[PDB]
Design a protein around this nucleic acid. Structure first.
Ligand SMILES: C[S@@+](CC[C@H](N)C(=O)[O-])C[C@H]1O[C@@H](n2cnc3c(N)ncnc32)[C@H](O)[C@@H]1O
Length: 460
RNA sequence: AGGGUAUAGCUCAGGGGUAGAGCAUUUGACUAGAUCAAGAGGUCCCUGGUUCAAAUCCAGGUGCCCUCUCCA
């Protein structure tokens, strides 16, 4: 609709092209079709998901209560507008709020401000512009000025600049709460509000300090993963890559905080964020450690590392290229950087399989779209580890696996791949809201999401 | 079969031989700054290798980073 395709390096886009135009897909669909599919994907990746999805912390508040409180909250934020809050029938603890956009009639002001690409993406998802996000602003900006926020999608704006000839993307208008002086004079690492978005291109609720013990902003497939893993109360679960602990706290909440959830991460501050989240949401069965997942198997003779076959369930939410991220308007990565994940994923996978009890469940999940990080890893896993066996999932929401890794149709039907190019981009407005069938909205929330991949394994 | 990165206070270009920009800061004019000028600035992370010569190329070491909604 409003935004162009995701700005990729020629080599990278050709890499992904090689991915989606393999012999098998061409065979079962034809070049003319697969190419259009790929281009449609690239066109969709630049646009926000049509649904703000919120996970309810059932261990502190029920979905009903939280939904009502959020109804009051949306009443306040949108000055009395009328956007619905659906409840997913399959994901019992997930709420869905439709996105009102895009709005092409926003009049651009002269006082401008430029944020980082990531901050821009956050703004498109319904966030305000907080102080650490601004990397450029009009030198004549005073606190209170109605300014126009632009996203430096290329990340080429040198901080503090008074002008920018690079690539900007209009995100909308907002009331500033700081002058350019207050921001860039001296070096105060100041926090707080910077630009209160009043007329965003996409209208989504701001989830900063609202019900922090009851909510958790989480993409639909991410919330789905913990359900697919299906943790039982009293079991021993471990996710190698956990920070900041969305799926971790979700797993803990599904177990009614009765059991043991060990969460690892390589970076310290991230682990601290895990612990902070767990403490915030009221989960006590969560124990977080700063540790290398690839070296998590006990070898010497003396917390991690852990003995092999000592965990009931294991979640590998492996680090990835993150190509399935939405909205992602540009990606200035090298191809070597994009394909730099398969080995690490395989190491973490091996460490996971070794750490898994017999008849245990291993859920491997990424947020990327590449074959080499998804289906290929499933094939590799099924070959190297013959004790593992691919399992069907519940709930089944996303599409089936992509052809190309040499898996059978029966095998692909047991994978869950979310495709951004599944359904057309819905340009929702209030008139579209009023005349909308509920099943259409639910299908929309299930299909128009970020790129994601879920695979389920069982040991013998 | 993991990868990227380290350069001025901040944000970053560059590049085998005299250290570069924007912003911040400093000073001087014009009416505190939507003006004009002027200069203050860095063992280019550590170590070793290649080389006449490494801030640049290579290897090892270390720190930071590779999202999976919102203080960026
Ligand atoms: C996709 S993110 C985690 C999202 C998280 N699972 C949730 O659902 O919020 C991958 C994480 O992997 C961690 N990580 C990166 N390398 C790792 C490694 N070798 N071992 C363990 N964790 C790693 C990163 O610090 C990052 O927090």
């Amino acid at each position: 609709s409003i935004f162009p395709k995701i700005s990729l390096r020629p080599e990278v886009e050709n890499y992904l092209k090689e991915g989606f135009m393999n012999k098998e897909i061409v065979t079962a669909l034809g070049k003319q079709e697969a190419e259009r599919k790929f281009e449609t994907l690239l066109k969709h990746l630049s646009h926000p998901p049509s649904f703000t999805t919120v996970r309810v912390n059932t261990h502190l508040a029920s979905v009903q209560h939280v939904k009502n409180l959020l109804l009051d909250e949306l009443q306040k934020q949108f000055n009395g507008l009328s956007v619905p809050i659906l409840q997913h029938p399959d994901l019992q603890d997930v709420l869905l709020i439709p996105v009102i956009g895009p709005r092409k009639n926003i009049k651009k002001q002269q006082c401008e401000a430029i944020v980082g690409a990531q901050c821009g993406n956050a703004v498109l998802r319904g966030a305000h512009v907080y102080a650490p996000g601004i990397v450029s602003a009009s030198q004549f900006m005073k606190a209170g000025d109605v300014i126009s926020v632009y996203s430096d999608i290329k990340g080429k704006c040198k901080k503090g600049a008074k002008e920018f000839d690079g690539t900007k993307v209009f995100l909308g208008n907002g009331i500033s709460e700081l002058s350019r002086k207050e921001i860039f004079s001296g070096l105060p690492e100041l926090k707080g509000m910077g630009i209160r978005m009043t007329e965003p291109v996409y209208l989504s609720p701001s989830f900063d300090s609202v019900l922090p013990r009851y909510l958790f902003l989480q993409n639909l497939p991410s919330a789905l993963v913990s359900h697919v893993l299906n943790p039982q109360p009293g079991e021993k679960i471990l996710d190698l890559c956990a920070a900041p602990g969305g799926k971790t706290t979700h797993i803990a909440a599904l177990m009614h905080d009765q059991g043991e959830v060990i969460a690892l991460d390589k970076i310290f501050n991230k682990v601290e964020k895990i612990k902070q989240n767990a403490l915030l949401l009221g989960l006590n069965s969560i124990r977080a450690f700063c540790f290398d997942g690839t070296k998590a198997v006990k070898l010497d003779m003396v917390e991690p590392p852990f003995l092999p076959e000592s965990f009931d369930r294991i979640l590998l939410d492996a680090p990835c290229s993150g190509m399935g991220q939405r909205p992602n308007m540009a990606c200035t990565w090298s191809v070597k950087e994009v394909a730099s994940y398969q080995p690490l994923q395989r190491k973490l996978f091996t460490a996971a399989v070794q750490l898994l009890k017999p008849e245990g469940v291993l859920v491997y999940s990424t947020c990327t779209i590449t074959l080499a990080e998804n289906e290929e890893q499933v094939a590799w896993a099924l070959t190297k580890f013959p004790c593992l066996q691919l399992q069907p999932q519940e709930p089944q929401i996303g599409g089936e696996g992509m052809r190309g890794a040499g898996l059978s149709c029966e095998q692909l039907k047991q994978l869950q791949r979310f495709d951004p190019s599944a359904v057309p981009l819905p340009d929702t407005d209030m008139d579209s809201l009023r005349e909308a069938r509920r099943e259409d909205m639910l299908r929309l929330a299930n299909k128009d999401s970020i790129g994601f991949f879920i695979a389920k394994f069982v040991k013998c």
